[PDB]
């Protein structure tokens, strides 16, 4: 029941859409709910969202938010945090300071590949004596068919498997975005895969939670909910377990 939740920005309506949805967390990409009131029984889990996020007010902020704290997001790309492992291995000690359980900064791609920027990650903060309690993942299919649920479980199996941490889902949907502007799938396309994809997350017992990308169609094309009217896949993702 725990596993389901999802990525928001405010709006009118947000509270009530997080409640009929039945999210059980929920994340804004930053330290705090960002004016958002949660409803009964949902967790806010905070995030450090970058380099320059790591301050003591930052810290502060996320400790009274939360008791889960999520690390950079997207380090490995040039238009997200855009970090080192240098650099996020040198400020991880702040974030470890907090006391709250730490997520590893959630990588765009390759988390599985030996050299990758997660592995180098990974690989550095146990030559550090540093603690990673779990790591959160990205992935976006460009398959369209009943076939892709098992490659987002064959990608997080094999995370999984390189480094024995429980497992989060913390941005997933299908986008290919191997061509000049992003391609989105059919809307029977994407209920369809928000009904196989939470069946087949619910059931993997590594993964600890999940958070489709996103609520909201003013934060992108695969949103869920229009203000507070859920789309067919709104009504999939509230329908799941
Ligand atoms: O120094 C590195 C850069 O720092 C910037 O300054 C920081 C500032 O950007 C940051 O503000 C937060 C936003 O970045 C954040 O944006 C969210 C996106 O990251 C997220 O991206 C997703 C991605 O996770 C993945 O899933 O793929 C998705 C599809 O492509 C992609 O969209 O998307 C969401 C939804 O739109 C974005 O909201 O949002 C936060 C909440 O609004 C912002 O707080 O804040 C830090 C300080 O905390 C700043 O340092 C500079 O502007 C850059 O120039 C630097 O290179
Ligand atoms: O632009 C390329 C895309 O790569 C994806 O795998 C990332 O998660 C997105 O943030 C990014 O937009
Ligand atoms: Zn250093």
Redesign the pocket.
Known sequence: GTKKGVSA?AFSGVTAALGDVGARWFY???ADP?GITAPAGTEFVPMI?????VTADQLQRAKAAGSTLLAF??PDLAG???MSVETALDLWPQLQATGMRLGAPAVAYGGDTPGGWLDRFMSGAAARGYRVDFIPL?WYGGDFSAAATGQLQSYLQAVYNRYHRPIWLT?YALTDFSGSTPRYPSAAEQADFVSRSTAMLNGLSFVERYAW??LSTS??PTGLYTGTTPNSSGVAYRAAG
Not at 49 to 53: K, P, Y
């Open positions: 920005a804004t990409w930053a960002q969202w970058g380099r320059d996020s997001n997207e997200q945090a855009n990205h941005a990308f996103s934060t992108t």
